[PDB]
Design an enzyme around this catalytic site. Structure first.
Site, PDB file in Angstrom:
ATOM      1  N   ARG A 177       0.833  -1.004   0.070  1.00  0.00           N
ATOM      2  CA  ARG A 177      -0.129   0.498   0.156  1.00  0.00           C
ATOM      3  C   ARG A 177       0.731   1.170  -0.426  1.00  0.00           C
ATOM      4  NH1 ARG A 177      -1.611  -1.381   5.075  1.00  0.00           N
ATOM      5  NH2 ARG A 177       0.162  -2.798   5.309  1.00  0.00           N
ATOM      6  N   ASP A 242       3.233  -7.902   7.012  1.00  0.00           N
ATOM      7  CA  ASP A 242       2.219  -7.403   6.845  1.00  0.00           C
ATOM      8  C   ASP A 242       0.886  -8.533   6.259  1.00  0.00           C
ATOM      9  OD1 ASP A 242       1.444  -5.935   3.856  1.00  0.00           O
ATOM     10  OD2 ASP A 242       1.386  -4.688   6.111  1.00  0.00           O
ATOM     11  N   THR A 243       1.014  -9.916   7.160  1.00  0.00           N
ATOM     12  CA  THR A 243       0.351 -10.837   6.789  1.00  0.00           C
ATOM     13  C   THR A 243      -0.559 -10.225   7.863  1.00  0.00           C
ATOM     14  OG1 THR A 243       1.032 -12.164   6.968  1.00  0.00           O
ATOM     15  CG2 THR A 243       1.692 -11.588   5.075  1.00  0.00           C
ATOM     16  N   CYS A 348       0.721 -20.908   0.151  1.00  0.00           N
ATOM     17  CA  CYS A 348       1.195 -20.084   1.347  1.00  0.00           C
ATOM     18  C   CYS A 348       1.582 -21.013   2.463  1.00  0.00           C
ATOM     19  CB  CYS A 348       0.507 -19.157   2.606  1.00  0.00           C
ATOM     20  SG  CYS A 348       1.356 -18.705   4.059  1.00  0.00           S
ATOM     21  N   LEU A 349       3.091 -21.063   2.950  1.00  0.00           N
ATOM     22  CA  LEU A 349       3.975 -21.872   3.358  1.00  0.00           C
ATOM     23  C   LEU A 349       3.830 -21.521   5.148  1.00  0.00           C
ATOM     24  CD1 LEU A 349       6.873 -22.768   1.486  1.00  0.00           C
ATOM     25  CD2 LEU A 349       4.994 -24.100   2.063  1.00  0.00           C
ATOM     26  N   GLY A 350       3.555 -20.241   5.576  1.00  0.00           N
ATOM     27  CA  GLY A 350       3.627 -19.876   6.832  1.00  0.00           C
ATOM     28  C   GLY A 350       1.842 -20.103   7.160  1.00  0.00           C
TER      29      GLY A 350
HETATM   30  C1  HEM Z   1      -3.137 -13.898   6.953  1.00  0.00           C
HETATM   31  C2  HEM Z   1      -1.447 -14.497   7.152  1.00  0.00           C
HETATM   32  C3  HEM Z   1      -1.301 -14.860   5.346  1.00  0.00           C
HETATM   33  C4  HEM Z   1      -1.550 -14.798   4.414  1.00  0.00           C
HETATM   34  C5  HEM Z   1      -3.706 -14.803   4.092  1.00  0.00           C
HETATM   35  C6  HEM Z   1      -0.782 -14.856   3.741  1.00  0.00           C
HETATM   36  C7  HEM Z   1      -1.133 -15.114   1.993  1.00  0.00           C
HETATM   37  C8  HEM Z   1      -0.117 -15.672   0.954  1.00  0.00           C
HETATM   38  C9  HEM Z   1      -0.508 -15.738  -0.051  1.00  0.00           C
HETATM   39  C10 HEM Z   1      -1.775 -15.816  -0.446  1.00  0.00           C
HETATM   40  C11 HEM Z   1       0.265 -16.501  -0.434  1.00  0.00           C
HETATM   41  C12 HEM Z   1       0.570 -17.272  -2.661  1.00  0.00           C
HETATM   42  C13 HEM Z   1       0.519 -15.796  -3.398  1.00  0.00           C
HETATM   43  C14 HEM Z   1       0.274 -16.361  -4.547  1.00  0.00           C
HETATM   44  O1  HEM Z   1       0.245 -16.950  -4.989  1.00  0.00           O
HETATM   45  O2  HEM Z   1       1.779 -15.610  -4.964  1.00  0.00           O
HETATM   46  C15 HEM Z   1       1.190 -16.496   0.144  1.00  0.00           C
HETATM   47  C16 HEM Z   1       2.753 -17.575   0.004  1.00  0.00           C
HETATM   48  C17 HEM Z   1       3.921 -17.363   0.960  1.00  0.00           C
HETATM   49  N1  HEM Z   1       3.246 -17.090   2.230  1.00  0.00           N
HETATM   50 FE1  HEM Z   1       2.235 -16.476   3.136  1.00  0.00          FE
HETATM   51  N2  HEM Z   1       0.319 -15.283   3.940  1.00  0.00           N
HETATM   52  C18 HEM Z   1      -0.231 -15.441   5.188  1.00  0.00           C
HETATM   53  C19 HEM Z   1       0.814 -15.402   6.217  1.00  0.00           C
HETATM   54  C20 HEM Z   1       2.193 -15.761   6.081  1.00  0.00           C
HETATM   55  C21 HEM Z   1       3.685 -15.582   7.006  1.00  0.00           C
HETATM   56  C22 HEM Z   1       3.381 -15.203   8.416  1.00  0.00           C
HETATM   57  C23 HEM Z   1       4.815 -16.131   6.268  1.00  0.00           C
HETATM   58  C24 HEM Z   1       6.196 -16.482   6.688  1.00  0.00           C
HETATM   59  C25 HEM Z   1       6.636 -15.449   7.580  1.00  0.00           C
HETATM   60  C26 HEM Z   1       4.277 -15.862   4.908  1.00  0.00           C
HETATM   61  C27 HEM Z   1       5.047 -16.875   4.017  1.00  0.00           C
HETATM   62  C28 HEM Z   1       5.052 -17.545   2.954  1.00  0.00           C
HETATM   63  C29 HEM Z   1       5.415 -18.015   1.889  1.00  0.00           C
HETATM   64  C30 HEM Z   1       7.282 -18.601   2.169  1.00  0.00           C
HETATM   65  C31 HEM Z   1       4.813 -18.144   0.395  1.00  0.00           C
HETATM   66  C32 HEM Z   1       5.555 -18.100  -0.906  1.00  0.00           C
HETATM   67  C33 HEM Z   1       5.205 -19.599  -1.091  1.00  0.00           C
HETATM   68  C34 HEM Z   1       5.225 -20.105  -2.648  1.00  0.00           C
HETATM   69  O3  HEM Z   1       5.959 -18.630  -3.614  1.00  0.00           O
HETATM   70  O4  HEM Z   1       5.446 -21.099  -3.410  1.00  0.00           O
HETATM   71  N3  HEM Z   1       3.004 -16.047   4.531  1.00  0.00           N
HETATM   72  N4  HEM Z   1       1.055 -16.200   1.684  1.00  0.00           N
HETATM   73  C1  LIG Z   2       2.563  -9.428   0.332  1.00  0.00           C
HETATM   74  N1  LIG Z   2       2.435 -10.478  -0.609  1.00  0.00           N
HETATM   75  C2  LIG Z   2       1.681  -9.900  -1.970  1.00  0.00           C
HETATM   76  C3  LIG Z   2       1.789 -11.633  -2.029  1.00  0.00           C
HETATM   77  C4  LIG Z   2       2.295 -12.713  -1.750  1.00  0.00           C
HETATM   78  C5  LIG Z   2       1.968 -11.667   0.604  1.00  0.00           C
HETATM   79  C6  LIG Z   2       2.858 -12.939   1.212  1.00  0.00           C
HETATM   80  C7  LIG Z   2       4.177 -12.468   1.511  1.00  0.00           C
HETATM   81  C8  LIG Z   2       4.536 -13.114   1.973  1.00  0.00           C
HETATM   82  C9  LIG Z   2       4.004 -13.979   2.528  1.00  0.00           C
HETATM   83  N2  LIG Z   2       2.903 -14.468   2.485  1.00  0.00           N
HETATM   84  C10 LIG Z   2       2.548 -13.409   1.535  1.00  0.00           C
END
Ligand code: HEM
Ligand SMILES: CN1CCC[C@H]1c1cccnc1
EC number: 1.14.15.1
Length: 407
Positions: A177, A242-243, A348-350
């Site tokens: 943002r 930022d999630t 998402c891995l987180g």
């Molecule tokens: C409410 C919290 C969260 C939401 C809704 C969220 C959402 C997402 C989404 C939508 C993606 C896929 C984006 C795409 O397809 O381009 C993603 C990917 C990812 N998220 Fe999250 N996330 C959250 C929290 C987190 C946290 C806390 C971490 C790590 C500290 C994290 C780590 C990852 C990683 C490593 C990926 C990459 C997976 C890949 O690209 O193969 N996320 N997340």
């Molecule tokens: C903020 N980002 C925009 C697309 C995926 C999302 C994100 C980033 C890091 C971890 N989880 C989600």
């Protein structure tokens, strides 16, 4: 303003939706995005805002595109184009087969095994912050708990000092943002400027922190490069800062406005896990996309190579064709269907870490401060973008209706 309409775009599919400032914003950000789902709106539209790009509006279209990485590439996943082109985080900017090998390494630092082991620290931090607010009878939830709870948990896991939070938080926000002071390329570079020296020092003398693990990591047997480590750490930074930070606000705002739904969780604790999923559906907040790898006809719409296409994760669960009474929060909903954490190879891995942080917050907050509400005469303003959030959430409560619980 508006970009001139491309030669192949049919005028009847033009719906000038602006993802960074939706017209119906005041009604609530999810509500603003839902306008793209009103009866008269087609399944696939084109907006002239932010450079011009397609927008899938239904869960069926959104799920399909995310599965088809051959036609829809993650190589330029953000709107506007300059940001998407400059975006190179790993594994988010890669498509299979290349991106697969990098997921396993990321799982080593944020996966279930690591989360399970963080449980005690997560509960401890949640309890101190909450007990710290309990006797005050007020707070601004975004700055008092939403940012500090998840951010400190991550800063700890990553071995990064808490005093660096305001700087890092500002930079990550310019990527989701932007306030206009920085381009996506510049914020990203300032982030890499912060991480580079640290990755170099962690490879020289490694610790047990997240960054040391990634920098000295291996993908499919070969050692990870310094450039690849940097690209993976940046993504992890945005995830911790930022999630969940934004999601907690949408959730607590709702709980503040529904004495009924919180009463359901106070009286029946075991349904908190289920409630978490429902809130994750109702208050979905992420919206990125993909870029066409070639001329393709998708559901009767002619798309040309290079066209960008927004596939809002937040929309699937809000679609009436996926959940019967979409805007209604029902903790007992039998099939909570959504794509809040994404869909396809980039799931998402987180998420496991996310769920524990949400579940611990709901349990530890309600247990100590069951009665609360929106501050007198305040109107909650939401903010839209690649990741939507809440500008400010001031809450109030009578201290006499609270209780200090020993952790
Ligand atoms: C409410 C919290 C969260 C939401 C809704 C969220 C959402 C997402 C989404 C939508 C993606 C896929 C984006 C795409 O397809 O381009 C993603 C990917 C990812 N998220 Fe999250 N996330 C959250 C929290 C987190 C946290 C806390 C971490 C790590 C500290 C994290 C780590 C990852 C990683 C490593 C990926 C990459 C997976 C890949 O690209 O193969 N996320 N997340
Ligand atoms: C903020 N980002 C925009 C697309 C995926 C999302 C994100 C980033 C890091 C971890 N989880 C989600």
């Amino acid at each position: 303003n508006l970009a001139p309409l491309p030669p192949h775009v049919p005028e009847h599919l033009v719906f000038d939706f602006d993802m960074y400032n939706p017209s119906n914003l005041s009604a609530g950000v999810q509500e603003a995005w839902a306008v793209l789902q009103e009866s008269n709106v087609p399944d696939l539209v084109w907006t002239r805002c932010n450079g011009g790009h397609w927008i899938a509006t239904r869960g069926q279209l959104i799920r399909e595109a995310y599965e088809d990485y051959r036609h829809f590439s993650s190589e330029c996943p953000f709107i506007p184009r300059e940001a998407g082109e400059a975006y190179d985080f790993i594994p988010t900017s890669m498509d299979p087969p290349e991106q697969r090998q990098f997921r396993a390494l990321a799982n080593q630092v944020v996966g279930m095994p690591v989360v399970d082991k963080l449980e005690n620290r997560i509960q401890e931090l949640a309890c101190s912050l909450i007990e710290s607010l309990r006797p005050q009878g007020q707070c601004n939830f975004t700055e008092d708990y939403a940012e500090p709870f998840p951010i400190r948990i991550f800063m700890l896991l990553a071995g990064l000092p808490e005093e660096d939070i305001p700087h890092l938080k500002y930079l990550t926000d310019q990527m989701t943002r932007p306030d206009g002071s920085m381009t996506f390329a510049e914020a990203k570079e300032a982030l890499y400027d912060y991480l580079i020296p640290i990755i170099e020092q962690r490879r020289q003398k490694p610790g047990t922190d997240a960054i040391s693990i990634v920098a000295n990591g291996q993908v499919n047997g070969r050692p990870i490069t310094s450039d690849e480590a940097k690209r993976m750490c940046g993504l992890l930074l945005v995830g911790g800062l930022d999630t969940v930070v934004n999601f907690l606000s949408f959730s607590m705002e709702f709980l503040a406005k529904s004495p009924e739904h919180r009463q359901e969780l106070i009286e029946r604790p075991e349904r908190i896990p289920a409630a978490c999923e429902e809130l994750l559906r109702r208050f979905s907040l992420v919206a990125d996309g993909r870029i066409l790898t070639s001329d393709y006809e998708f559901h009767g719409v002619q798309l040309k190579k290079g066209d960008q296409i927004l596939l809002p994760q937040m929309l699937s669960g809000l679609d009436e064709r996926e959940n019967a009474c979409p805007m209604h929060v029902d903790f007992s909903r039998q099939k909570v269907s959504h794509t809040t954490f994404g869909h396809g190879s980039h799931l998402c891995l987180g998420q496991h870490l996310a769920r524990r942080e949400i579940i611990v917050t709901l349990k530890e907050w309600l247990t100590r401060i069951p009665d609360f509400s929106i501050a007198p005469g305040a109107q909650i303003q939401h903010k839209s973008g690649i990741v939507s959030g809440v500008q400010a959430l001031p809450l109030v409560w009578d201290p006499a209706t609270t209780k200090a619980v020993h952790h």
